[PDB]
Paper text:
Chalcone synthase, a well-studied ubiquitous plant-specific type III polyketide synthases (PKSs), is the first key enzyme in the flavonoid biosynthetic pathway. The biosynthesis of flavonoids starts with the condensation of one molecule of p-coumaryl CoA with three molecules of malonyl-CoA through the catalysis of chalcone synthase (CHS) to generate naringenin chalcone. Functional characterization of two chalcone synthases (CpCHS1 and CpCHS2) indicated that CpCHS1 can catalyze the formation of pinocembrin, naringenin, and eriodictyol, respectively; however, CpCHS2 was inactive. The crystallization investigation of CpCHS1 indicated that it has a highly similar conformation and shares a similar general catalytic mechanism to other plants CHSs.
The crystal structure of CpCHS1 was elucidated in the apo and presence of its final product naringenin, and detailed structural comparisons of CpCHS1 with EaCHS from Equisetum arvense and PpCHS from Physcomitrella patens revealed common differences between CHSs in the local conformation around the active site pocket. And by site-directed mutagenesis, we found seven residues, especially Leu199 and Thr203 that are critical to the catalytic activity for CpCHS1.
Numbering used by the authors:
A (entry chain C): 5 to 403
B (entry chain A): 6 to 401
The structure:
């Protein structure tokens, strides 16, 4: 028998509208690093100035990175007091953990305070917390730590996403979607907070993929408030989450691997990451657009007629996706702007881009929060090789 | 505040409650008798000179409520790794080498059993939730499990790392929203825990680390969760109706865990059984109001629901029983798993769920929950976090 007790009404009432972004806040550590002269600083502080050839290669990596500056919790004083972090391969995890278990929820709190202020509702209305970081682990997690720092209700429903990597900006959108939609009244605080203190290390002539990481990764935290059924005249919608998908791309074993070791977090590239992403992105998107839009003539937007939020893992990914899909160069502009101003902040990146997109749209008096377009994409890429796809709708603006 | 015109939900949602459709479990092959574990433990850590500490540990084991545990570790592995037999040696790297391979492996064993019971093609799994407190890696154990099972590369994964002992409740809360908000979703949930990250030699000045050595065992459990079971094809066992999370008052620092170069370290700083047992009544009173209302004759007593309680240790079960005035039968299923397996962290509560339905079938009871319609699943861990889940059984 597949017998069951008599049905009862859904005991936890669900919402009816789509999960909606209601506020966005961001924060970065206070130490600014100009990319043009980062090689000078980096080879000085790692006591590596005798590696003249390797410094030239690193100057090339920095010059070609698409990054103008980065923010970091680390500075010269902290690094000098921790020589094991300045070496390429010395036991360090303990001091790295000591830093990030405190500083990632601290930075997350700064971003969350800004999101909550914009939202304009009292903190006690937050029912769910999603915390995402690739920088350290602890028990209780950063989610608990953030709850304490902000003074949220002790009954918030928390989800702690540790050690996930660069695609997880897409993942948290996918997680928040179901939380918000399946729970009437739920208001989800999503915080992504990333610090390079776990990955910073000195240079090695035989590990150029680890060196690329030293040129690309920067610090940042972003926070959003997600809910369904926004309260009219009280809350303000900015983006709607309509579709989510995840894909391990074909032939991509080992493309991006990271290991938490006694020497800290190591970062490995072993496949042509921009090549794998660009080779497969068309089928990923074609499937997503079919699910969202169907396929009747004149009903499916062209890729040039949606807004783009693409994780800028490096400039080559954006370049090769733009080439493969024949995007006009303005499509990737917002994603490139955040790469320029902040570098690769791992999971936090895509929310910085989302914030930049709406703020530029308002300033330039465009017809929507997504550059004048109704529909858009948010894409995360990372270990797997995992591609996270999110189809969004903007909101109309007065032009 | 304007929006575009509303449209129908683009990913259709389900209508019924999230339902447990299958359960499978698995344990490493090395069995450890709890009565003689102090002999084994003090020998393999070369600590036989700590005569008074061993007496203390024999007492802890005698009173643990545990008869046996399963572990990936054994004498051979431990002799090859003296840095794990010391109290405080750099070891993380070898611990990680073990658990990044072995926790998805053990999870795959439990998952294959769940999937076989479920009876549906594995390509029908749409989501994976992987939960562990044993190691971290990128890609994570969710990706590894997906590869080992041959699941569809488009499965939507949720990787829950470094969670701790409450997370068996957390994954029920996560699976609920995944299943209910997505028509057709079938969620593979796996909890897999290995003591290789926490095992270490004894210290006469850190008795709380000695607690973990007496209580923690290894295991993995897997469930298939979905809403709207396919008629005459899938078989419901339990329904998820209500979930809540609470950080209990005055519990700051009661249970901390840190991942260090010496592995995962375990710290107890307040009266954990006391904090849980003194605050659980308020938590459950709230959940029962939300689920059943406040009307005379409408709300079941705690004695008239089935219990699935994370057996962090015997004192938690004993004090919850006393503070809530439970008859002794209520904690029996939870105590049975503690006896047969020890504290398997997040995986425990799903072992208890499996035992409960299996004992119900073999004893020809009226429901999959010991004959009771409504039940509770509780997880407890760092925070101090209490995860509460109200379940419904099915008639038998």
């Amino acid at each position: 028998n597949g017998a069951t007790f008599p049905p009862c009404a859904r005991k936890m009432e669900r919402a009816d509208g789509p999960a909606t972004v209601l506020a966005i806040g961001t924060a970065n550590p206070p130490n600014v690093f100009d990319q043009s002269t980062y090689p000078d600083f980096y080879f000085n502080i790692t006591n590596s100035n005798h590696m003249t050839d390797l410094k030239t290669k690193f100057q090339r990596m920095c010059d070609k990175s698409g990054i103008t500056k980065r923010y970091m919790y680390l500075n010269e004083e902290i690094l000098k007091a921790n020589p094991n972090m300045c070496a390429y391969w010395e036991k360090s995890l303990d001091v790295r953990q000591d830093m990030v278990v405190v500083e990632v929820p601290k930075l997350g709190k700064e971003a969350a305070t800004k999101a909550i202020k914009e939202w304009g509702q009292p903190k006690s209305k937050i029912t769910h917390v999603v915390f995402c970081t690739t920088s350290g682990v602890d028990m209780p997690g950063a989610d608990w730590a953030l709850t304490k720092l902000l003074g949220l209700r002790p009954s918030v429903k928390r989800l702690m996403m540790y050690q996930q990597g660069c695609f997880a900006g897409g993942t948290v959108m996918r997680v928040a979607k179901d939380l918000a939609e399946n729970n009437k009244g739920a208001r989800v605080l999503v915080v992504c907070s990333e610090l390079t203190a776990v990955t910073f290390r000195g240079p090695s002539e035989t590990h150029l993929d680890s060196l690329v990481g030293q040129a690309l990764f920067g610090d940042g935290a972003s926070a959003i408030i997600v809910g369904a059924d926004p309260i009219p005249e009280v809350e303000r919608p900015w983006f709607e989450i309509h579709y989510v998908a995840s894909n391990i791309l074909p032939d991509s074993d080992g493309a991006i691997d990271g290991h938490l070791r006694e020497v800290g977090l190591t970062f490995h590239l072993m496949k042509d990451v921009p090549g794998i992403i660009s080779k497969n992105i068309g089928t990923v998107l074609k499937d997503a657009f079919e699910k969202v839009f169907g396929n009747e003539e004149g009903e499916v937007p062209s890729y040039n007629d949606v807004f783009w939020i693409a994780h800028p893992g490096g400039p080559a990914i954006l370049d090769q996706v733009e080439q493969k899909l024949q995007l006009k160069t303005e499509k990737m502009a917002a994603s490139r702007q955040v790469l320029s101003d902040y570098g690769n902040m791992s999971s936090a990146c895509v929310l910085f881009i989302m914030d930049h997109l709406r703020k530029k749209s308002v300033e330039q008096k465009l017809a929507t929060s997504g550059e004048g377009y109704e529909w858009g994409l948010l894409l995360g890429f990372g270990p797997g090789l995992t591609c996270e796809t999110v189809v969004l709708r903007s909101v109309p603006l007065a032009t």
